[PDB]
Write a protein that holds these residues in place. Structure first.
Motif, PDB file in Angstrom:
ATOM      1  N   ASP A 411     -43.760  54.308  -4.804  1.00 22.02           N
ATOM      2  CA  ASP A 411     -43.040  55.442  -5.388  1.00 22.02           C
ATOM      3  C   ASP A 411     -43.291  56.722  -4.595  1.00 22.02           C
ATOM      4  N   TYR A 412     -44.478  56.841  -3.999  1.00 23.78           N
ATOM      5  CA  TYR A 412     -44.862  58.010  -3.224  1.00 23.78           C
ATOM      6  C   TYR A 412     -45.281  57.468  -1.859  1.00 23.78           C
ATOM      7  N   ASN A 413     -44.291  57.326  -1.001  1.00 18.07           N
ATOM      8  CA  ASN A 413     -44.369  56.466   0.172  1.00 18.07           C
ATOM      9  C   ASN A 413     -45.000  57.258   1.321  1.00 18.07           C
ATOM     10  N   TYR A 414     -46.309  57.468   1.216  1.00 23.78           N
ATOM     11  CA  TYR A 414     -47.083  58.245   2.194  1.00 23.78           C
ATOM     12  C   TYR A 414     -48.243  57.391   2.720  1.00 23.78           C
ATOM     13  N   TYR A 415     -48.441  57.398   4.032  1.00 23.65           N
ATOM     14  CA  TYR A 415     -49.548  56.658   4.650  1.00 23.65           C
ATOM     15  C   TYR A 415     -50.855  57.400   4.575  1.00 23.65           C
ATOM     16  N   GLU A 416     -51.864  56.681   4.085  1.00 25.48           N
ATOM     17  CA  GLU A 416     -53.249  57.111   4.112  1.00 25.48           C
ATOM     18  C   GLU A 416     -53.547  58.440   3.401  1.00 25.48           C
ATOM     19  N   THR A 417     -52.809  58.728   2.329  1.00 26.23           N
ATOM     20  CA  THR A 417     -53.034  59.945   1.583  1.00 26.23           C
ATOM     21  C   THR A 417     -54.547  60.211   1.422  1.00 26.23           C
ATOM     22  N   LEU A 418     -55.034  61.296   2.017  1.00 24.25           N
ATOM     23  CA  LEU A 418     -56.469  61.443   2.221  1.00 24.25           C
ATOM     24  C   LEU A 418     -57.207  61.732   0.917  1.00 24.25           C
ATOM     25  N   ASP A 419     -56.594  62.535   0.035  1.00 23.39           N
ATOM     26  CA  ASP A 419     -57.200  62.822  -1.260  1.00 23.39           C
ATOM     27  C   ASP A 419     -57.350  61.581  -2.132  1.00 23.39           C
ATOM     28  N   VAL A 420     -56.535  60.561  -1.838  1.00 18.81           N
ATOM     29  CA  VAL A 420     -56.564  59.252  -2.518  1.00 18.81           C
ATOM     30  C   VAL A 420     -57.489  58.270  -1.796  1.00 18.81           C
ATOM     31  N   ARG A 421     -57.436  58.252  -0.465  1.00 19.05           N
ATOM     32  CA  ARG A 421     -58.266  57.304   0.318  1.00 19.05           C
ATOM     33  C   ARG A 421     -59.780  57.599   0.187  1.00 19.05           C
ATOM     34  N   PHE A 422     -60.135  58.840  -0.133  1.00 19.02           N
ATOM     35  CA  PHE A 422     -61.483  59.230  -0.541  1.00 19.02           C
ATOM     36  C   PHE A 422     -62.054  58.226  -1.579  1.00 19.02           C
ATOM     37  N   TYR A 423     -61.185  57.738  -2.480  1.00 21.99           N
ATOM     38  CA  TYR A 423     -61.499  56.712  -3.475  1.00 21.99           C
ATOM     39  C   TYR A 423     -61.134  55.308  -2.947  1.00 21.99           C
ATOM     40  N   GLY A 424     -59.909  55.186  -2.425  1.00 28.51           N
ATOM     41  CA  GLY A 424     -59.294  53.872  -2.130  1.00 28.51           C
ATOM     42  C   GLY A 424     -59.781  53.142  -0.880  1.00 28.51           C
ATOM     43  N   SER A 425     -60.529  53.825  -0.008  1.00 23.47           N
ATOM     44  CA  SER A 425     -60.832  53.253   1.289  1.00 23.47           C
ATOM     45  C   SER A 425     -62.163  52.493   1.296  1.00 23.47           C
ATOM     46  N   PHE A 426     -62.855  52.365   0.165  1.00 30.26           N
ATOM     47  CA  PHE A 426     -64.134  51.624   0.140  1.00 30.26           C
ATOM     48  C   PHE A 426     -64.070  50.185   0.717  1.00 30.26           C
ATOM     49  N   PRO A 427     -63.046  49.396   0.361  1.00 28.82           N
ATOM     50  CA  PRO A 427     -63.025  48.070   0.954  1.00 28.82           C
ATOM     51  C   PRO A 427     -62.902  48.124   2.475  1.00 28.82           C
ATOM     52  N   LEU A 428     -62.204  49.112   3.035  1.00 28.92           N
ATOM     53  CA  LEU A 428     -62.103  49.149   4.507  1.00 28.92           C
ATOM     54  C   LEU A 428     -63.427  49.499   5.150  1.00 28.92           C
ATOM     55  N   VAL A 429     -64.125  50.527   4.654  1.00 35.24           N
ATOM     56  CA  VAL A 429     -65.426  50.844   5.258  1.00 35.24           C
ATOM     57  C   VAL A 429     -66.429  49.674   5.077  1.00 35.24           C
ATOM     58  N   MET A 430     -66.374  48.972   3.952  1.00 38.04           N
ATOM     59  CA  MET A 430     -67.381  47.962   3.638  1.00 38.04           C
ATOM     60  C   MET A 430     -67.087  46.592   4.224  1.00 38.04           C
ATOM     61  N   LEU A 431     -65.809  46.290   4.453  1.00 39.76           N
ATOM     62  CA  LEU A 431     -65.379  44.966   4.947  1.00 39.76           C
ATOM     63  C   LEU A 431     -64.573  44.897   6.276  1.00 39.76           C
ATOM     64  N   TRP A 432     -63.898  45.985   6.652  1.00 38.76           N
ATOM     65  CA  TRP A 432     -63.162  46.094   7.904  1.00 38.76           C
ATOM     66  C   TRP A 432     -63.454  47.435   8.550  1.00 38.76           C
ATOM     67  N   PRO A 433     -64.737  47.702   8.867  1.00 38.37           N
ATOM     68  CA  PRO A 433     -65.071  49.082   9.264  1.00 38.37           C
ATOM     69  C   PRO A 433     -64.397  49.590  10.536  1.00 38.37           C
ATOM     70  N   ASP A 434     -64.056  48.707  11.485  1.00 38.72           N
ATOM     71  CA  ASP A 434     -63.341  49.141  12.696  1.00 38.72           C
ATOM     72  C   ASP A 434     -61.957  49.734  12.352  1.00 38.72           C
ATOM     73  N   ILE A 435     -61.315  49.202  11.333  1.00 42.18           N
ATOM     74  CA  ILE A 435     -60.059  49.777  10.861  1.00 42.18           C
ATOM     75  C   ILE A 435     -60.345  51.145  10.249  1.00 42.18           C
ATOM     76  N   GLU A 436     -61.331  51.213   9.383  1.00 36.02           N
ATOM     77  CA  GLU A 436     -61.672  52.490   8.711  1.00 36.02           C
ATOM     78  C   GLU A 436     -61.960  53.632   9.722  1.00 36.02           C
ATOM     79  N   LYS A 437     -62.766  53.345  10.731  1.00 34.65           N
ATOM     80  CA  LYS A 437     -63.082  54.359  11.744  1.00 34.65           C
ATOM     81  C   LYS A 437     -61.883  54.786  12.552  1.00 34.65           C
ATOM     82  N   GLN A 438     -61.016  53.828  12.881  1.00 30.48           N
ATOM     83  CA  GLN A 438     -59.706  54.132  13.485  1.00 30.48           C
ATOM     84  C   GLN A 438     -58.860  55.102  12.648  1.00 30.48           C
TER      85      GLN A 438
END
Ligand SMILES: OC[C@H]1O[C@@H](O)[C@H](O)[C@@H](O)[C@@H]1O
Ligand SMILES: [Ca+2]
Length: 768
Positions: A411-438
């Motif tokens: 509905d809100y078609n935005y990539y990597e909304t930062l105020d949201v990824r602050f919460y939503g990005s835990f699986p990337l840092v914990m399981l795919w950290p090379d993606i997270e750092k990118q």
């Protein structure tokens, strides 16, 4: 049900009856248009950046995310598993499509539709799902395990546009039974991306790959054109021969017909005509079929693997940019490689199963954790694949890095909304950290971009500058426009005056260093300038010189319709934590002057924060709003991240504990008896704050993050009870039917806003 014992489904798998109706389902809590695809959903198939396919608990292939960034819900009725069974000594067998439904029109009317109720179950523990078929009229019981190889710390198989369907068949009766299993697939080239003549040139071919102890038979569904466009490529389905099974196929049946060209063969004896036919179609839709047939004796079990692949190498975004998808690194870019992908799956699926088990095992084997919590933890990960995920391997026409983006939602078609990824990005840092750092380096690179062109702010209709130098962007673009190239697609508010983005950015950087071992100084070095810039710009927004940026009495942070004014608990705590992080980074990189400045800012802001907001029981919402004494669920978000980042106390232990207990007591336990999460705003008299729709919502991601905070602070019972309400609403029969589409928010009636939302990936903050 004699089949379950022959397969290994974990007890924490989410379960539902095949064909079950759900009565309580929620719908959007808004009066403007919003996605509602119904509760008929399932765990997705497909890797990161590959496009995904949602196969629902009713068996249909229905939620199409193959066009990257788009969500299209429509059942392609030709795409199915079907079964034939004949008991030795009967004149006739029976044939049944394993779909609890039928087509809307008269296409495929000859097939046997409407798989009956109370005759099977669907199970999901992402990346795995299962169906069992326990039907009075099918003496042989069948199950399938379906998955894609989504594997932490693996950036290769995790990208693949492939799915495996591992079938198990068991005869509990005392008669021999002939069994067939058939996979049908429509040639879907032209399903999207093609402006005219949507089937024209589509053709199907059969590949037989016969080598010692490995026979594969596959259909490749492609187009005669060698054009390198978004719409062109191949789908493949196939099967691997095992002892005791014969393979049959049919290269071409008409999907835009009654289907009897295929079905008269299968319904007779479960054996197809083996008719190859590469004739391309013009207007008619076409499909292929791959079948196995076998005889099961009393007590006998057999296992047989099928697979599905899709080689659609190019993703196009609405702004015109075309990019290669990540998997093309491993299989090629020309869109003629679906068989290679399929073959890789059929020859390696057992290894992939073991790799998945190996990463799920540490959680699943921990008997201190309730099963419901494991259901949510794994199944929330569906969004990493299903979130319009883009992962590029070069611009078409055109590097060492592969840019990545996960949508906020559809509905809100935005990539990597930062105020949201602050919460939503835990699986990337914990399981795919090379993606997270990118992703974080992507943000670092935008800090000093300036785009002086103007846009109309949706909330108030004023004009504003698109991108200001030194302000972190809200997002990295939209799939309707130019992901990674045109940032700040969001326009409801002006994100260049937001008070949380710059601090959340710094906190994200330091998180990513800490949670990957505190070893990656190179990552800290790459981001250091942007971190200093971000805090230095935010400091200038302190109007009254209390050392803290002032919220401006407009929604200038993630709660984008909920006004803050003055010093807010939310932005103020985030600022304090961000300062403490930058101090530590300064120490690591030996930037003494930065250490000293941020230490001084921190000490001044800390004492002022406490003075302005500590009220004896909790921290006030802010200093200047009409309901400034509201109890906010997220009031100490800065201290939450400080715990994770091991930055210690930014506020006194005793006051944090009191605040958390108050939030549990009020925002959880006085909101529908604590059965639905933490409501965002509560008045001190115990009534929900009605000043904005956001104050009256539970935010699923905020609630799971708050559960994490409570957990680290020793409030174990409160933590899990708080999270349980989110699990219940999402997955339970007493909930609102949001499985595999967890929304941002619900109100007290259970109705929702923004299904398929990134924020509730924050449940992984409970595993730190
Ligand atoms: O639901 C609140 C959210 O709405 C979205 O449209 C915005 O992009 C987010 O920044 C915001 O946090
Ligand atoms: Ca101030």
């Amino acid at each position: 049900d004699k089949i379950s014992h022959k397969i290994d489904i974990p007890d924490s798998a989410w379960t539902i009856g095949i064909g079950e109706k759900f009565k309580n389902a929620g719908h959007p809590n808004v009066k403007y248009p919003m996605i509602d695809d119904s509760y008929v959903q399932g765990a997705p198939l497909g890797g990161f950046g590959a496009g995904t396919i949602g196969r629902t608990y009713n068996g249909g292939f229905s939620r199409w995310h193959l066009e990257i960034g788009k969500n299209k819900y429509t059942t392609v009725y030709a795409n199915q598993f079907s079964v034939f069974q004949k008991v030795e000594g009967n004149k006739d067998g029976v044939a049944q499509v394993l779909y609890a439904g039928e087509p809307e029109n008269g296409y495929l009317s000859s097939w046997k539709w409407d798989y009956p109720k109370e005759s099977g179950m669907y199970y999901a523990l992402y990346p795995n799902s299962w169906y069992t078929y326990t039907n009075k009229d099918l003496p042989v019981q069948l199950a399938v395990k379906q998955f894609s190889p989504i594997i932490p710390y693996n950036y290769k198989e995790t990208s693949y546009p492939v799915a495996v369907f591992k079938w198990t068949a068991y005869n509990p009766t005392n008669k021999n039974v002939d069994v067939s299993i058939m996979f049908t697939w429509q040639n879907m080239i032209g399903f999207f991306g093609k402006q005219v003549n949507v089937n024209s040139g589509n053709f199907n071919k059969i590949i037989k790959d016969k080598s010692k102890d490995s026979e594969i038979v596959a259909a490749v569904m492609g187009n005669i054109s060698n054009d390198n466009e978004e719409w062109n490529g191949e789908y493949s389905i196939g099967v691997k021969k095992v002892p005791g099974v014969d393979i049959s196929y049919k290269a071409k049946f008409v999907t835009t017909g009654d289907g009897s060209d295929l079905w008269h063969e299968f319904s007779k004896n479960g054996i197809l005509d083996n008719k190859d036919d590469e004739t391309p179609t013009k207007q008619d839709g076409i499909g292929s079929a791959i079948a196995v047939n076998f005889k099961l004796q009393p007590g006998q079990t057999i296992e047989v693997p099928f697979a599905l692949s899709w080689d659609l190498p190019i993703m196009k975004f609405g702004g015109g940019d075309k990019w290669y998808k990540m998997y093309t690194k491993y299989f090629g870019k020309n869109g003629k490689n679906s068989f290679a992908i399929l073959k890789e799956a059929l020859n390696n699926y057992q290894k992939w199963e073991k790799m998945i088990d190996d990463w799920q095992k540490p959680i699943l084997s921990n008997k201190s954790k309730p099963d419901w919590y494991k259901t949510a933890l794994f199944n929330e990960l569906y969004y990493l694949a299903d979130g319009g995920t883009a992962w590029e391997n070069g611009k078409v026409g055109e590097r060492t890095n592969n840019m990545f983006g996960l949508l906020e939602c559809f509905d809100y078609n935005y990539y990597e909304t930062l105020d949201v990824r602050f919460y939503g990005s835990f699986p990337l840092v914990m399981l795919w950290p090379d993606i997270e750092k990118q992703v974080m380096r992507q943000f670092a690179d935008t800090i000093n971009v300036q785009d002086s062109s103007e846009f109309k702010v949706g909330s108030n209709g004023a004009m504003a500058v698109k991108k200001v130098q030194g302000m972190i962007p809200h997002d990295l673009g939209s799939s309707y426009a130019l992901p990674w190239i045109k940032i700040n697609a969001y326009d409801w508010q002006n994100p260049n005056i937001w008070k949380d983005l710059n601090s959340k950015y710094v906190l994200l950087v330091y998180r990513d260093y800490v949670l990957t071992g505190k070893t990656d100084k190179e990552f800290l070095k790459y981001t250091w300038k942007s971190v200093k810039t971000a805090l230095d710009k935010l400091k200038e927004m302190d109007k009254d010189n209390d050392g803290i940026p002032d919220n401006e009495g407009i929604p200038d942070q993630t709660y984008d319709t909920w006004s803050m004014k003055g010093t807010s608990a939310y932005c103020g705590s985030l600022w304090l934590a961000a300062l403490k992080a930058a101090q530590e980074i300064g120490k690591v990189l030996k930037d003494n002057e930065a250490y000293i400045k941020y230490n001084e800012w921190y000490k001044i802001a800390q004492q002022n924060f406490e003075k302005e907001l500590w009220n004896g029981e909790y921290y006030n919402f802010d200093t200047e709003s009409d309901h400034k004494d509201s109890i906010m669920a997220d009031q100490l978000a800065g201290q939450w991240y400080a715990d994770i980042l091991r930055l210690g106390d930014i506020l006194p232990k005793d006051h944090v504990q009191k605040a958390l207990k108050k939030i549990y007591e009020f925002n959880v336990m006085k909101f529908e008896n604590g059965k639905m999460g933490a409501v965002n705003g509560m008045r001190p008299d115990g009534i929900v704050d009605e000043s904005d729709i956001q104050a009256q919502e539970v935010w699923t991601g905020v609630t799971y993050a708050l559960a994490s905070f409570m957990k680290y602070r020793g409030m174990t019972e409160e933590a899990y009870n708080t999270a349980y309400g989110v699990y219940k609403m999402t997955y339970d029969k007493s909930g609102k039917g949001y499985w595999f589409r967890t929304p941002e928010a619900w109100t007290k009636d259970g109705n929702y806003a923004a299904s398929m939302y990134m924020r509730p990936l924050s449940i992984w903050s409970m595993e730190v």
